[PDB]
Design a protein around this ligand. Structure first.
Ligand code: NAI
Length: 405
């Protein structure tokens, strides 16, 4: 019988990483984000043909949902995910994208996806072909890539990004989510090679290659728009994201966008912006001990002010207010800001005060570690309402219109 091909999927955590995902729960999570967008209402004057680079999880998935179900856009998505198979659940991003194709088709929306290395020339060429065959051109390009490594499309060199400070070693407090102990560790300052590598991986070169491979193709509409997602944060994380190796990468983004805006604004009044979003739980959060503690504190503080939100709420506002509306939130460098509720002085002062009082004993009285754990499990499709986690499921979920690179 088919029970031999099905299985009961449960959370399995190895190395602060959940190595399983639940297809039914992932589908329920995507539908929850779709339902939020539709309940909030349509978004006027948004793009109608959208390319989302990094479209399977987190903010990129939220952008695909907002564009599709908020602006009514046909969406082409690029991601790097593992399909499921007998006895081996695929990645959450695979099941999320399967659900997106299903729900998009129900609403008569075009949904095609490409699975492969977005840093490579091959994948850029497949994406170009897809646009030529189906859409003609795209109005908006969302760059939402997060990877620890990058294979250079020319030299073949493999760059690995580093999460380290610059100048002086730093003592970072954090929360070990396997042991549930508050703990500190010292990070050494990044070497020059580590900094260049992080710029190469998380900088803006690949975003630039995408736009310049699409422009000479040519598949960008008049008034075309593009934005890249980033995080700046405040003092608690500044040793890494302001001044650290990743801060060096974000400094790269800030200058490469200038070249992109120049090229687009001559092309029908288009526009390009770095968009700064708030911190959220992602698949890799528990692997950096600082973020679980910061997010747990931030969640409690913001919940007490009625300002807590996740990916789909952040990105729905970015579209409605800044990318397509007339409530844009520019900053001195020319970045779009949607993180202002996280950076509110009273929130950060309260997170900082608590940051110095949390111990192993009072974690659940001072932080929303409960909420962090729930949202973390939700990423992989676990703990979702309405899902019968006792039922067998076939982990081999297929995706129509999925180009395998
Ligand atoms: N997580 C956070 O708190 C914040 C993240 N951001 C930014 O948002 C953007 C999205 O990242 P996140 O959503 O955090 O994590 P994420 O892991 O949720 O999403 C990463 C996406 O990139 C895709 N991807 C990774 N390597 C790839 C490759 N080689 N080829 C093709 N696709 C590949 C994945 O399939 C996935 O769709 C990033 O630029 C990040 O810096 C901005 C503010 C806060």
């Amino acid at each position: 019988g088919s029970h031999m091909l099905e299985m009961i999927i449960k959370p399995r955590v190895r190395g602060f990483i959940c190595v399983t995902a639940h297809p039914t729960g992932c589908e329920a999570n995507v539908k929850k984000q779709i339902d939020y967008v539709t309940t909030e209402g349509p978004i006027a004057n948004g793009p109608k043909r959208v390319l989302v680079i990094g479209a399977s999880t987190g903010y990129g998935l939220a952008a695909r949902i907002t564009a599709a179900f908020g602006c009514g856009a046909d969406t082409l998505g690029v991601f790097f995910e593992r399909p499921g198979e007998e006895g081996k659940p695929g990645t959450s991003g695979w099941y999320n994208s399967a659900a997106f194709h299903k729900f998009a088709a129900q609403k008569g929306l075009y949904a095609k996806s490409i699975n492969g290395d977005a840093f490579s020339d091959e994948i850029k060429q497949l994406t170009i072909d897809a646009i030529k065959q189906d859409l003609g051109q795209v109005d908006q390009v969302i760059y939402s890539l997060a990877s620890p490594r990058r294979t250079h499309p020319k030299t073949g060199e493999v760059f690995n990004s580093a999460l380290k400070p610059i100048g002086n070693a730093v003592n970072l407090r954090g929360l070990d989510t396997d042991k549930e102990v508050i703990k500190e560790s010292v990070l050494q300052p990044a070497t020059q090679s580590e900094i260049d590598s992080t710029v190469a991986v998380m900088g803006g070169e690949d975003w630039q290659m995408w736009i310049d491979a699409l422009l000479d193709a040519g598949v960008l509409a008049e008034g075309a728009q593009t934005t890249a997602f980033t995080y700046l944060g405040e003092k608690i994380t500044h040793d890494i994201y302001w001044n650290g190796s990743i801060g060096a990468a974000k400094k790269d983004l800030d200058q490469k966008v200038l070249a992109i805006r120049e090229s687009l604004a001559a092309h029908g009044g288009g526009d390009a912006r770095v968009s700064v979003l708030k911190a959220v739980v992602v698949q890799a959060s528990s692997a950096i001990p600082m973020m679980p503690l910061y997010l747990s504190l931030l969640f409690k503080v913001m919940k007490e002010k009625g300002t807590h939100e996740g990916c789909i709420e952040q990105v729905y506002s970015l579209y409605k207010d800044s990318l397509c509306g007339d409530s844009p939130h520019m900053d001195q460098e020319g970045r779009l800001r949607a993180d202002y509720k996280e950076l509110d002085p009273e929130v950060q002062n309260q997170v900082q005060q608590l940051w110095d009082q949390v111990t192993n004993d009072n974690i659940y009285q001072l932080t929303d570690f409960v909420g962090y754990k729930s949202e973390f499990l939700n990423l992989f499709g676990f703990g979702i309402d309405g899902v019968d986690y006792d039922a067998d499921v076939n982990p081999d979920v297929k995706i129509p219109n999925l180009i395998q690179g």
